Amino acid sequence: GIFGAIAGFIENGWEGMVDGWYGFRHQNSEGRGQAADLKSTQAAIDQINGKLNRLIGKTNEKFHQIEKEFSEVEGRVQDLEKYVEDTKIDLWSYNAELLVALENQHTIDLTDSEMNKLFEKTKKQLRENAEDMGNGCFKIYHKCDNACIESIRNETYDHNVYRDEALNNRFQ
């Protein structure tokens, strides 16, 4: 949304992937080597658990309160006790609304930042050997046998050994 990762960046979701939140999928002569990156996922699961721990498991200690239901009518004293409880409810009802609305907008922006980081960190490894083709997919312009996907996920890619062949094929 904020980073524009939904409207035209990926353009679709994946339904068959239930073993991870972020993954790498590629197509070549070998096969579909789908794999997941648990390091970026650990940031999201640690954040959402910490937010819940501030909310769940927290109780407020209240023992004695004023009477709320009355079977007999009384003067201004009855009207004040009925009014003061309603003011507590309305303030707590509205504070509950912002305790839901604000964090829902926050968690949408935060998940797109992880997607934006994952998209941008691939560009850092491939300085000039990768350009997006308009649907969230990068073209590599050299061979990507099984050693490539191990380097990308582990962030151990070295561009020096693949520099000469990639630039030669793309230009001339």
Binding site: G1, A5, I6, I10, N12, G13, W14, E15, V18, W21, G23, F24, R25, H26, Q27, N28, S29, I48, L55, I56, G57, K58, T59, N60, K62, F63, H64, E67, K68, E69, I89, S93, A96, E97, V100, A101, L102, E103, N104, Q105, T107, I108, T111, D112, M115, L118, T122, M133, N135, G136, C137, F138, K139, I140, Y141, H142, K143, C144, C148, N169
Partner: protein
């Protein structure tokens, strides 16, 4: 077959077709891949008894158990953490009505104890253990177990001047009443004087009650009515009573101490589980930070909101399947 120069790498995020609606700032109908409920809209239907002690109403009112009603004699010397009062409770005994009913109910509920010790007042010239035909105990006439009803001894009434000083390091509570006869003949038959006046005093505060004579609507074939007051005796003070006629003699004191005890009104039965929060609808789990079953609660309980539900997003934007 695919050429080695046609290598491509794509990125994306997972999605589930079973999306749920989550209200937020952007739009009220945005689908999220997963969400959890943040409010408790359901209750068990009964009150568990394990973290706190709950004393059953058993068709008894708290004021009725305080005075010692014959139908409610089983509540003598009992302590509670949360008293409950049944909505169908009724009493068939001497008719009573107190000034500041909400006051007397609340303060005895805060202490949560009914510990009692017998004090021997220095009575003379008067009769004790006054009984009435309205209340029946063991096929015989009786009265409240904690109030001594005073009548006439011979055709005379002594000038009462009686006191009971306190020297212990805790606060007492003397439940003393006043009796309003219905007819002037009943006034003569019980005290043999035209009128009576009652005044009590402590070192700090004093009270004065002038009983009134007159007809009242008949309840169980008696027009007389009783009004119950109360006083607090601090250590180092003294309680002095000077009155003649229409006096309801207290039989002792009720212990008062600060605590977490309270009172709730419900009709649900009891149960046995580890839940802590108690509502008149029943026990509810505390994992939800909000609840909407009722605004009346006791113990560690979540907040009350009027909203039906509150959905919180725990995932990214959920794209539903492909275009088709």
């Amino acid at each position: 077959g695919n050429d080695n120069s046609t290598a491509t790498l794509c990125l994306g995020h997972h999605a589930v077709p079973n999306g749920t609606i989550v209200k937020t700032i952007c739009n009220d109908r945005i689908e999220v891949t997963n969400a959890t409920e943040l409010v408790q809209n359901s209750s068990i239907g009964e009150i568990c008894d394990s973290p706190h002690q709950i004393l059953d109403g058993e068709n008894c009112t708290l004021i009725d158990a305080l005075l010692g009603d014959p139908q409610c004699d089983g509540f003598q010397n009992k302590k509670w953490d949360l008293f409950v009062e049944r909505s169908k409770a009724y009493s068939n005994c001497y008719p009573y009505d107190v000034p500041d009913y909400a006051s007397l109910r609340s303060l005895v509920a805060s202490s949560g104890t009914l510990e009692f010790k017998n004090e021997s007042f220095n009575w003379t010239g008067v009769t004790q253990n006054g009984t009435s035909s309205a209340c029946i105990r063991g096929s015989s006439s009786s009265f409240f177990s904690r109030l001594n009803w005073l009548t006439h001894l011979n055709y005379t009434y002594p000038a009462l001047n009686v006191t009971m000083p306190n020297k212990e390091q805790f606060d007492k509570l003397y439940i003393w009443g006043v009796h309003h006869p219905g007819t002037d003949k009943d006034q003569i038959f019980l005290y043999a004087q035209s009128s009576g006046r009652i005044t009590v005093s402590t070192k700090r505060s004093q009270q004065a009650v002038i009983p009134n004579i007159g007809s009242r609507p008949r309840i169980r074939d008696i027009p007389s009515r009783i009004s119950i007051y109360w006083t607090i005796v601090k250590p180092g003070d003294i309680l002095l009573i000077n009155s003649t006629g229409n006096l309801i003699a207290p039989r002792g004191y009720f212990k008062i101490r600060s605590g977490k005890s309270s009172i709730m009104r419900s009709d649900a039965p009891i149960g046995k589980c580890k839940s802590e929060c108690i509502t008149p609808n029943g026990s509810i789990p505390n994992d939800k930070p909000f609840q909407n079953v009722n605004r009346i609660t006791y113990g560690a309980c979540p907040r009350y909101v009027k909203h039906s539900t509150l959905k919180l997003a725990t995932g990214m934007r959920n794209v539903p399947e492909k275009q088709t």
